[PDB]
Design a protein around this ligand. Structure first.
Ligand code: HEM
Ligand code: HEM
Ligand SMILES: [Cl-]
Ligand SMILES: [Cl-]
Ligand SMILES: [Cl-]
Ligand SMILES: [Cl-]
Lengths: 276, 267
């Protein structure tokens, strides 16, 4: 598998690029320039349902980000291709991004970009070691990543008394202690990975972001399938018991996408499932 | 029905506001501040599926913007409430917009805003426009898409390729031509709709704010599915230089003698 999915420590910066396929005839030259550069460590690759649909190929486990008909909003903004750049120098990532964007034209056009950088403790409780591989990597070495750009209203959240803030997350801000008497709407009670009848463990690799769209969390959930993320999101959205996650009171996702992260061979990224 | 849906000529400016429901507990007071101001002419109202879901009510004909699993991208960014301001003075519309945004606060947060400014020979007119866009109860069902075009790429193609993408009329144009994909008479239940689109330009780019109003969503949806290649594998040429950034379905409620009629939703 692409080692960057689980490899730690996470670099301080990331650039997420999302592309729309606008000229399918030019796709081979774009892939010829892109794929030798995908090492699964500083450059990771994800494939969206539209690209598989455009090639008449059905990738097992790959589907668009779903449509949840709920009382909260989880938009589906599925794109064809996802590039995940990782590094410690922000300026170097931007120049690498620009070269990759131009390398993918005219086949692809840039549809979205998120610049991630590394007040609760998001991303703990992630599976570790062999359990992280089991949770995030399918048998063939593929992974299935859900991406949501969440926008926060910290003015409203920090205006609440600390007791209500902790009731929304489900843990104390002072020492990150779990609250057993927290309401069922508390976030960690909605996403309790052990609380789903088929356990819903996933590996989260989120980053902070801030641009003209606001500020918040670039949420990334990697699993051996999309099922873990989707059952969790459906419960958060009130589709299981009518109880909505408290997160939606001060935060909302602006984007939503499903991407198949192909396996690595010993010599590079393996797209044989998609290409002949 | 809300008369602004069909009244023509279209004023030079429109402000589309879209809201997300973040505090349902504050919804009754927010609606009490909004509804007396909705006249269906200079301020029109649309209701999204999330708002009905939050109230536990099923509005007949109302559903979220669909998820099209196609080789082109039509995102679903469904919001709870849509305000459609119409007028000739841009500054007056923005001043009204701010007042409405603040009136809906606590309950709603602003999720999206589109500043619209102004062939249509096949758009329904007169009684045919009423028939196409207005349901029996006076409701309408509006599909909204914020399309972003790359006219630099479109005008770089030879003029013949430009004309084959739109279809103009060109009888020998390929089936992928836009006017051949959207021929309202070419759908087995004819797919006539009333279009009320406007141009836009902001930090997201520039293009067309597409608005399709029908007595149900069926006309828009079968057309979009054909445009996306889901009907016969042939994709509309529009997608070669343009793509929608947003997507939403909204139920435009009827008007009573005294104002907008939300009894189906609030009872
Ligand atoms: C604005 C977006 C989000 C923020 C700020 C956020 C923040 C947090 C925080 C503070 C915790 C508690 C500490 C931890 O275990 O990480 C947590 C836990 C968790 N979150 Fe989120 N989260 C967000 C969205 C999501 C979403 C959309 C999912 C969907 C699957 C998710 C899944 C989880 C899981 C699985 C846990 C661990 C639960 C367990 O203990 O088993 N998070 N998150
Ligand atoms: C970037 C977005 C769009 C642009 C720039 C655009 C432009 C055009 C143009 C140039 C025409 C030919 C002249 C005319 O009859 O109006 C046309 C026709 C038409 N388009 Fe679009 N269009 C867009 C999106 C859509 C969408 C999304 C739909 C339906 C879901 C649609 C439905 C129609 C219909 C019904 C006609 C009537 C003429 C015919 O089909 O023969 N348009 N449009
Ligand atoms: Cl290819
Ligand atoms: Cl091996
Ligand atoms: Cl574009
Ligand atoms: Cl064709």
């Amino acid at each position: 598998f692409q080692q960057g999915i689980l490899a730690t420590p996470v670099p301080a910066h990331a650039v997420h690029l999302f592309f729309t396929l606008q000229s399918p005839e030019d796709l081979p030259a774009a892939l010829d320039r892109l794929l030798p550069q995908v090492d699964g460590k500083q450059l990771l690759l994800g494939i969206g349902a539209p690209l598989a649909k455009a090639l008449g190929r059905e990738i097992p486990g790959l589907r668009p980000f779903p449509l949840l008909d709920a009382a909260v909003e989880n938009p589906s903004t599925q794109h064809a291709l996802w590039l995940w750049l990782r590094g410690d120098d922000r300026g170097d990532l931007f120049h690498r991004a620009q070269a990759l964007i131009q390398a993918l034209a005219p086949a692809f056009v840039l549809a979205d970009e998120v610049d991630g950088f590394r007040g609760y403790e998001d991303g703990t409780e992630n599976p570790q070691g062999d359990e992280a591989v089991e949770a995030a990597i399918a048998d063939d070495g593929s992974s299935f990543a859900a991406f949501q750009l969440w926008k926060h209203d910290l003015d409203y959240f920090k205006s609440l008394p600390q007791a209500e803030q902790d009731n929304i997350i489900g843990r104390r801000l002072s020492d990150n202690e779990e609250l057993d008497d927290a309401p069922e709407s508390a976030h960690v009670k909605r996403t309790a990975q052990e609380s789903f009848e088929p356990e819903a463990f996933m590996v989260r690799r989120s980053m902070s972001w801030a641009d003209g769209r606001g500020a918040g969390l670039a949420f990334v959930a990697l699993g051996h399938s999309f099922d873990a993320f989707e059952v969790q999101l459906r419960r958060m959205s009130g589709l299981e018991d009518g109880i909505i996650d408290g997160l939606y009171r001060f935060s909302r996702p602006l984007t939503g996408g499903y991407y198949w992260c192909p396996p690595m061979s010993e010599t590079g990224v393996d797209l044989s499932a998609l290409l002949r």
